[PDB]
C-alpha cells in the first residue's frame, strides 16, 4: 500500500513510520513545511503507526533527540515514539479489509488528518487545538499534551486490568476530537476500508 505523508504545518516535523519491532519503509524523514513523503507499506502489515516528531536535532549518522515522539534517538524509527504523539494507526489486509484510526491514547502533539486516497471509506481527523487547551497536569514541557496514563501511571488511566472507564482527562481529548480514541476501552472509532487501499496522512490539515 502507498501512504503519502504531507506536512501542512508551518514548522518542520520529522515523520516516523513503524510497526513496533521494525521500520516501515525508511522509518523516518524530515518534512519541511509543504513537503510530501511517499512510503510503501507491505500488504498484511498489522499494527503500523505513523506520527510526527517535533524539535529534533540529528547528526550525521542520524542520531539525536526530539522533544515529542522520539524513537530512541534515531532519525529512522524502528520502534514506537515517546509520548505525547498523535497516532495514525492501521492494520492492512486483515481478512480482506483495512482498518484505520487516529488515537490520542498516547497523547497529542500535532493535529492530523488520516484519509484514503482510493475509494470505499471515509477519513478521520483530529485537528483541534488540544495543546492550547491542554489541562495543566497533562501539559508536556517539550510541547504537546500527555495522556493521563503516561503522566500518572494508574491502573484506571492505563486500563491495566482490562477494565476501566472514561475519566476527566480522557473526556477532554474526546470532547475536542470525537473521532479519535481517548482511552483504551473507548467506543471504537475505527474505519473499515477495502483491503489494499492507499492513504494520505496530513499534519496540520486545517492550519
UniProtKB/Swiss-Prot annotation:
Disulfide bonds join 9-204, 56-66, 71-77, 121-193, 126-177, 134-145, 149-158, 159-164. PROSITE patterns: THAUMATIN_1 (PS00316), THAUMATIN_2 (PS51367). InterPro entries: Osmotin/thaumatin-like_sf (IPR037176), Thaumatin (IPR001938), Thaumatin_CS (IPR017949). GO terms for cellular component: cytoplasmic vesicle. It holds the Pfam family Thaumatin. It is found in: Cytoplasmic vesicle. CDD domains: TLP-P. Keywords: Cytoplasmic vesicle, Disulfide bond, Signal, Taste-modifying protein. It comes from the Eukaryota. Belongs to the thaumatin family. Taste-modifying protein; intensely sweet-tasting. It is 100000 times sweeter than sucrose on a molar basis. This is Thaumatin I. It comes from Thaumatococcus daniellii (Katemfe).
Amino acid at each position: 500500500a502507498t501512504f503519502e505523508i504531507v506536512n501542512r504545518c508551518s514548522y518542520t516535523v520529522w515523520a516516523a513510520a513503524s510497526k513496533g519491532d521494525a521500520a516501515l519503509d525508511a522509518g523516518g524523514r524530515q518534512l519541511n513545511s509543504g513537503e510530501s513523503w511517499t512510503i510503501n507499506v507491505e500488504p498484511g502489515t498489522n499494527g503500523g503507526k505513523i506520527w510526527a516528531r517535533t524539535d529534533c536535532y540529528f547528526d550525521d549518522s542520524g542520531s539525536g533527540i526530539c522533544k515529542t515522539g522520539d524513537c530512541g534517538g534515531l532519525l529512522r524509527c524502528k520502534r514506537f515514539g515517546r509520548p505525547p504523539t498523535t497516532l495514525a494507526e492501521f492494520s492492512l489486509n486483515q481478512y480482506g479489509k483495512d482498518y484505520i484510526d487516529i488515537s490520542n491514547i498516547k497523547g497529542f502533539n500535532v493535529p492530523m488528518n488520516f484519509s484514503p486516497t482510493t475509494r470505499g471509506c471515509r477519513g478521520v481527523r483530529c485537528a483541534a487545538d488540544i495543546v492550547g487547551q491542554c489541562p495543566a497536569k497533562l501539559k508536556a514541557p517539550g510541547g504537546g499534551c500527555n495522556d493521563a496514563c503516561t503522566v500518572f501511571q494508574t491502573s484506571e488511566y492505563c486500563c491495566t486490568t482490562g477494565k476501566c472507564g472514561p475519566t476527566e482527562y480522557s473526556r477532554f481529548f474526546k470532547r475536542l476530537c470525537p473521532d479519535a480514541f481517548s482511552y483504551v476501552l473507548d467506543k471504537p472509532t475505527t474505519v473499515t476500508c477495502p483491503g489494499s487501499s492507499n492513504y494520505r496522512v496530513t499534519f496540520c490539515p486545517t492550519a
